[PDB]
Amino acid sequence: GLVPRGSHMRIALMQHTARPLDPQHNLDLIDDAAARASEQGAQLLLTPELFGFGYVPSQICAQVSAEQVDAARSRLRGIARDRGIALVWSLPGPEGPEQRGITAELADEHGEVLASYQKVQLYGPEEKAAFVPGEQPPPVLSWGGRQLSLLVAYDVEFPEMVRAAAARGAQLVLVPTALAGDETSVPGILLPARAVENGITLAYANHCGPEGGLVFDGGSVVVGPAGQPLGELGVEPGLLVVDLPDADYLQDRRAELHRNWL
Amino acid sequence: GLVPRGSHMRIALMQHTARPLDPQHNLDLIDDAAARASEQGAQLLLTPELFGFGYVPSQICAQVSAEQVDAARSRLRGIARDRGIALVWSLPGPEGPEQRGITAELADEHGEVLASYQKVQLYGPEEKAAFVPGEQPPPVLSWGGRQLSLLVAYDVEFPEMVRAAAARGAQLVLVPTALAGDETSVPGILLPARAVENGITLAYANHCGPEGGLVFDGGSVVVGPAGQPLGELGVEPGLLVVDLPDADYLQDRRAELHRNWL
Ligand SMILES: NC(=O)c1cccnc1
Numbered sequence A, B: 001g002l003v004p005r006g007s008h009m010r011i012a013l014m015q016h017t018a019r020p021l022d023p024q025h026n027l028d029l030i031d032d033a034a035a036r037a038s039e040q041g042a043q044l045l046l047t048p049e050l051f052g053f054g055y056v057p058s059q060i061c062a063q064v065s066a067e068q069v070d071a072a073r074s075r076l077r078g079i080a081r082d083r084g085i086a087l088v089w090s091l092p093g094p095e096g097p098e099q100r101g102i103t104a105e106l107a108d109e110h111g112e113v114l115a116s117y118q119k120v121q122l123y124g125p126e127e128k129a130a131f132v133p134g135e136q137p138p139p140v141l142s143w144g145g146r147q148l149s150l151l152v153a154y155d156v157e158f159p160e161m162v163r164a165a166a167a168r169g170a171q172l173v174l175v176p177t178a179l180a181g182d183e184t185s186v187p188g189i190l191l192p193a194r195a196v197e198n199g200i201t202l203a204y205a206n207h208c209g210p211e212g213g214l215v216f217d218g219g220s221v222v223v224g225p226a227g228q229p230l231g232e233l234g235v236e237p238g239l240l241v242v243d244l245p246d247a248d249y250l251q252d253r254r255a256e257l258h259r260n261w262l
């Protein structure tokens, strides 16, 4: 409804089904969602992991060129600008098929790429055959009056990855994902702890429905610092729109000891 | 009931109210619980943080001598032996009042002290005025056919502390605690994640009721590797007895990167 009294940030999450190896289709879906989110007063749209090509790691490595990635990237940049909304997307990285990772990028409403990140924690043998793991910590940046950060999918299941973002100042962690197999423990158990154990908000945007030989769970969610869902979807396509309201674990943690004990 | 087919470990958790600065009373309560647990076929009893003197940090530092600590320790050792049950207790450490931490120790049914641990993550200004933080990682040891470990209270709220135990091989993490203030997020949100994110079982033994100017929450619980409660108490004194049944986060985590990013 109307933009509320105590809130200066409204975010949207796109939950949908991608078609493998059909970027025109999947990017048309992103464009649709961007327009709709913008019309509802959202200032940012989060979209799912590898959405533009589908979550099909082995086929991305075999069939998707660098030039095809770049064409999808340019189109997404154009959607951010033309729909007048900040956009988080996830594509393969820009290098050749044998050198690139899974990435996420944040563009603002003018189309500026503010931040780029390469997934550090690859999931399973197919991802590890198709992609190179990232080696850099999550980025943290001011946008819309808060410190935003990016992580991808499996990354968020590691407390260390969320802690790395929060140690840099993150307040809002945005996570494209691709979770199938009725893995209710990730949104149900791990995400709430990630939020509480850092005092942060996390947004988690999944595929749903039949795609790439899997049936994705949906369950997209925004979790606030008390671990509660600010908004959530079920198993069907949807656009989740959430107004964010404006123990000291981060100070208390004995990081110099912890780093020796991992 | 009868010791079940698929289980070779039955554990007990004592949840009760301590009297500040009255070790005879509080250790009599531990003895009672040890006897009862042993009669029910439990092989180990976990008891709460600082139970023998009450959770009264400032008064422990002002009034409880080293010699008084040692007398309580010897009595607890005797309860393990005389009740024929392994026992986890938590007392101040053995040094002078200005040099000692909060500790936990595991004795076997013969009274052998198998392991000792000093709380690394002190909670709040009163603990930090009264006790020295520990500097050593959690111990991990074979007992009863599994790898057991110790952590104390606030420690378990840090993913790094549980990860440190699991990295050493822990399967069962035993946690004396003292949690008041209706802090439902610790057992409700953090403990289940600790268990899932390492694939371990955790046992969490709280005070309950009015003690030391607080009203403790109870909520003692054993959480298995899927994050579910194997057994749980409410707010009243009780003895929880649980039979333990017999993603690869621990291998997949990029620990050499994580250690640079905390
Ligand atoms: N954004 C607003 O102007 C507004 C007006 C009335 C009620 N809520 C919000």
Ligand SMILES: NC(=O)c1cccnc1
Binding pocket: A091, A092, A093, A094, A103, A104, A105, A116, A117, A118
């Ligand atoms: N995908 C990306 O992260 C990226 C970063 C810089 C340039 N092109 C792509």
Ligand SMILES: NC(=O)c1cccnc1
Binding pocket: A049, A122, A123, A152, A153, A154, A155, A177, A178, A179, A180, A183
């Ligand atoms: N896409 C992912 O990183 C993933 C898939 C399955 C489980 N957890 C994470």
Ligand SMILES: NC(=O)c1cccnc1
Binding pocket: B002, B003, B004, B005
């Ligand atoms: N421990 C046992 O002998 C037993 C016997 C029957 C049923 N369950 C356990």
Ligand SMILES: NC(=O)c1cccnc1
Binding pocket: B091, B092, B093, B094, B103, B104, B105, B116, B117, B118
């Ligand atoms: N409380 C303890 O940890 C301890 C260890 C060794 C000797 N005495 C006490």
Ligand SMILES: NC(=O)c1cccnc1
Binding pocket: B049, B122, B123, B152, B153, B154, B155, B177, B178, B179, B180, B183
């Ligand atoms: N006893 C503790 O370490 C403690 C107290 C309050 C909150 N969390 C932990």
Ligand SMILES: [Cl-]
Binding pocket: A223, A224, A225, A226, A227, A228, A229
């Ligand atoms: Cl919340």
Ligand SMILES: [Cl-]
Binding pocket: B223, B224, B225, B226, B227, B228, B229
């Ligand atoms: Cl479980």
